[PDB]
Design a protein around this ligand. Structure first.
Ligand SMILES: *[C@@H]1O[C@H](CO)[C@@H](O[C@@H]2O[C@H](CO)[C@@H](O)[C@H](O)[C@H]2NC(C)=O)[C@H](O)[C@H]1NC(C)=O
Ligand SMILES: *[C@@H]1O[C@H](CO)[C@@H](O[C@@H]2O[C@H](CO)[C@@H](O)[C@H](O)[C@H]2NC(C)=O)[C@H](O)[C@H]1NC(C)=O
Ligand SMILES: *[C@@H]1O[C@H](CO)[C@@H](O)[C@H](O)[C@H]1NC(C)=O
Ligand SMILES: *[C@@H]1O[C@H](CO)[C@@H](O)[C@H](O)[C@H]1NC(C)=O
Lengths: 222, 270, 214, 176
């Protein structure tokens, strides 16, 4: 079918520049109104602009929030649309989609790309410090115990956490990474029975491919 | 005040062939690769705001089919997005099924070249092992595989020649089905309006309707989205019809006239 | 230069109930409006175009209506997959602006938070740091209010909360709360409390511990 | 017509070459069947009988192609015969519109494919209509006159035939 794929996302420092790409792949009846759209995580969509095809003078349009600063353009013989971004601000950190109408006449965006992530911040690559979280020494009430695992002070996203290397998934909660100053922080809860613990050992699998550091940390009682 | 049904035209210079008709200028097409060009748009016929009888609207850029109203407030084109995208989707699926067929034939042309090059490299080794490495029985057995190969090539040739003719004829036929599909959709939008308006509007015959009552932009959309309250404007229409016992004479200018609404209309219009 | 105020921003309904999402356009648009559906971590997907027309491969429960500046968007009978995010868009004139959006959620029976406090780690106390986590797992509705209290006085700075989306398994929300401190200050105080105020109780649901661990 | 003859040529040359190689294989199969008498041995036998089976599969193949080329050859003629007859009907109308353009109102369309002149056109003038140089303003006046030489209208003949009103006379609707 028709298929859109973005590329060129990643880490970029404030005030710098970056050049995204969108490669239409598949038999297209026309690849005219190629529009760029971004979406800050948890926020709404935002239209950036579009660019007509060769069969309409390669004309472009923008919004009064990125005009002049961004520059949509398509390759002369590669069938790829580009987005040259300049003086990137922190507010520009968001997923960037590309999308265009099915055929001629732009009634609505039919086809979308999976999106590519742009992150505008200073920061540095940092490996988190894994910490366990056993209940208070006080006699916990009920026959059900709740455990935890804190992953503080690291960058960039993402980070994958698993309990017992996937063997434990039911009754588990891992929360969105929140930004602590300039380092991300997240935790992960897990609720089990008082029978399967601490008799059987539970371990917190941490993984941060950026720093190339994996750290398992068994939860111990007392 | 008057509403018109029309369609798209532009500066395109692409030409498709149908079986009966060649070099037909269409507004949108698609090149398949082997001289095969399929129409996607419609007959490009650019041009008092006339309807669809003797023209396509260059001014209507929003779609393939649409209207051109006119009234107190103003006038302007308005493509029917439902109609146009329905036509687009239908045609796209058709065009794709063709691409699909061509794919298998390309994959077919691919595999045949692969095995063809395998055999010759195998025939070569056989001709070399008939030198380097009952003996006479293996020779004419090899020369029998060779003769079968050339008969194989003559076979692949014939199939190729046939698939080519069927590929062309398929496009020549699908190009007619498409152009006809367009002419269909356009008439359907006309009959639909004709149904709603009834006698509250005069058929001009050029693809447009003259209202016997003043229809504002709001009313114009009722004609479009199919909610035309006919009884609403019924009376003032019923009036303006009769506002305007033998009949008068038709203009003598060597043109045949027909009698309608108490006026002489050309026979060459119907 | 053309505004699109899409309301409501969030809605709650059970399976089969009908939901209608409005979308008011600042300037006149006519019929040039579309509707999308974005699943979490996925790209948007076209549903309606030309204000009322459904894209191909779209169910019949979905339906759009409206013209000019006032547009609607219904769902006949809601289903499990339908409780995601939805955006409206205008394509009459540049810029083709989107609406605010609307996040749908399942309407279930209320649930008490699995409140639980978690003192600092001996590991963290080694690098001259300390954090106090507080998990409020599996609670509905989403509206909850944590309040930290060290030695009987409220705490605001150093707090760091987080919320998960309405869990796909039990339709209940879960919350984190990482109260961060310096090792020097954590030692000076003793009683550490976090008061989780939820609809499932008049009196606050509170866990705590005294520093006398060690 | 020639492009068709050309296509048929290749197919004839094709039918020619296939017969040539077909007769070569059988003469080769024959020698193999005779050297399997006159002149591991059992491995050469089923290898021969495999070439034979492939041959009959080859003939079934040539048969199918032949059947198809025949249908496409016929349909090609049935289609080109329509394109031709239509091409004729086109050319004829073009010669009519061309004359119709020149004459304008100086001549009456009879409707039967002919034009009645409102002015006397000699053999010289007749060729001006043919070689496309009809001086219309030349005979304009005496034409403009003879038009008006011949306020309600009269009745159409009652004979169960529909009449249309043109140049102040009743013409049959079955003519248009
Ligand atoms: C079809 O179009 C008509 C007219 O454009 C719409 O009717 C009007 O809707 C607006 C919104 O309230 C107002 O002008 C009036 O309520 C209606 N007109 C009159 C004269 O009452 C109608 O809503 C449209 N319907 C659809 C399905 O598109
Ligand atoms: C077209 O035909 C007309 C008439 O047959 C030709 O005009 C006449 O030419 C001859 C030769 O001189 C004379 O009768 C007159 O000179 C012309 N007629 C008149 C009324 O003046 C004309 O030459 C022909 N042209 C072509 C290109 O064939
Ligand atoms: C040719 O055929 C062989 C065996 O069928 C296969 O392994 C090889 O990949 C083919 N070549 C290509 C280019 O596909
Ligand atoms: C048959 O084929 C052989 C070899 O391809 C060729 O030499 C011979 O001339 C052909 N016979 C005829 C009648 O063309």
């Amino acid at each position: 079918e028709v298929k859109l794929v973005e590329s060129g996302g990643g880490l970029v420092q404030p005030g710098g520049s970056l050049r995204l790409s969108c490669g239409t792949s598949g038999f297209t009846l026309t690849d005219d109104y190629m529009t760029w759209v971004r979406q800050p995580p948890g926020k709404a969509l935002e239209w950036l602009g579009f660019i007509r095809d060769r069969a309409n003078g390669y004309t472009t349009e923008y919004s009064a929030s990125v005009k002049g600063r961004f520059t949509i353009s398509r390759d002369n013989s590669q069938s790829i649309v580009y987005l040259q971004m300049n003086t990137l601000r922190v507010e520009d950190s968001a997923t960037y989609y590309c999308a265009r109408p099915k055929g001629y006449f732009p009634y609505a965006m039919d086809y979308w790309g999976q999106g590519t992530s742009v992150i505008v911040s200073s920061a540095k690559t940092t490996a988190p410090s894994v910490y366990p979280l056993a209940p208070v020494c006080g006699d916990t009430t009920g026959s059900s115990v709740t455990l935890g695992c804190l992953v503080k002070g690291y960058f960039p996203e993402p980070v994958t956490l698993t309990w017992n290397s996937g063997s434990l998934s039911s009754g588990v909660h891992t929360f969105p990474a929140v930004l602590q100053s300039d380092l991300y922080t997240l935790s992960s809860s897990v609720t089990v029975t008082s029978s399967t613990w601490p008799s059987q050992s539970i371990t917190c699998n941490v993984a941060h491919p950026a720093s190339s550091t994996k750290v398992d940390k068994k939860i111990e009682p007392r | 005040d008057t509403i018109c049904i029309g369609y798209h035209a532009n500066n395109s210079t692409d030409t498709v062939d149908t079986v009966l008709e060649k070099n037909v200028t269409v507004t949108h097409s698609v090149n398949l690769g082997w001289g095969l060009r399929m129409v996607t748009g419609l007959r490009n016929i650019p041009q008092a705001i006339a309807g669809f009888i003797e023209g396509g609207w260059t001014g209507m850029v929003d779609g393939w089919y649409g209207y051109h109203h006119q009234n107190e407030q103003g006038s302007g084109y308005a493509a029917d997005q439902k109609s146009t995208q329905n036509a687009i989707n239908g045609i796209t699926n058709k065009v794709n099924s063709v691409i699909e067929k061509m794919g298998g034939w390309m994959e077919w042309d691919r595999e045949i070249n692969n095995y063809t090059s395998i055999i010759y490299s195998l025939i070569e080794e056989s001709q070399n092992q008939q030198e380097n490495g009952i003996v006479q029985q293996q020779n004419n057995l090899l020369r029998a595989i060779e003769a079968q190969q050339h008969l194989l090539q003559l076979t692949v040739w014939g199939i190729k020649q046939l698939q080519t003719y069927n590929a062309e004829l398929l496009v020549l036929l699908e190009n007619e089905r498409t152009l006809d599909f367009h002419d269909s959709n356009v008439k359907n939008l006309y009959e639909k309006v004709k149904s709603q308006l009834k006698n509250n509007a005069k058929e001009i015959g050029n693809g447009c309707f003259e209202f016997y009552h003043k229809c504002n932009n709001e009313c114009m959309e009722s004609v479009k989205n199919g909610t035309y309250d006919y009884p609403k404007y019924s009376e003032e229409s019923k009036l303006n019809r009769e506002k305007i016992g033998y009949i008068p004479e038709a203009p003598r200018d060597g043109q045949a006239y027909v009698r309608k609404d108490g006026e002489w209309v050309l026979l060459s219009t119907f | 230069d053309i505004q699109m105020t899409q309301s409501p921003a969030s809605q709650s309904a059970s399976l089969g109930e009908s939901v209608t999402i409005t979308c008011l356009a600042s300037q006149t648009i006519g019929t040039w409006l579309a509707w999308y559906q974005q699943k979490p971590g996925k790209s948007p997907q076209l549903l309606i175009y030309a204000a009322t027309s459904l894209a191909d491969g779209v169910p019949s429960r979905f339906s759009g209506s409206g013209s000019g500046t006032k547009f609607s968007f219904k769902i006949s009978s809601l289903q499990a997959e339908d409780f995601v995010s939805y955006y409206c868009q205008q394509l009459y004139s540049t810029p083709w602006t989107f609406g605010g959006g609307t996040k749908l959620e399942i309407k279930r029976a209320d649930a008490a938070p699995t409140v639980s406090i978690f003192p600092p780690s001996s590991e963290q106390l080694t690098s001259g740091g300390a954090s106090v986590v507080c998990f409020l797992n599996n609670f509905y509705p989403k509206d909850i209010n944590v309040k930290w209290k060290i030695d009987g006085s409220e705490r605001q700075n150093g707090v760091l909360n987080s919320w998960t989306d309405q869990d796909s398994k039990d339709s209940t929300y879960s919350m984190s709360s990482t109260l961060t401190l310096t090792k020097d200050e954590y030692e000076r105080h003793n009683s550490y409390t976090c008061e989780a105020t939820h609809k499932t109780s008049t009196s606050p649901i509170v866990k705590s511990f005294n520093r006398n661990e060690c």
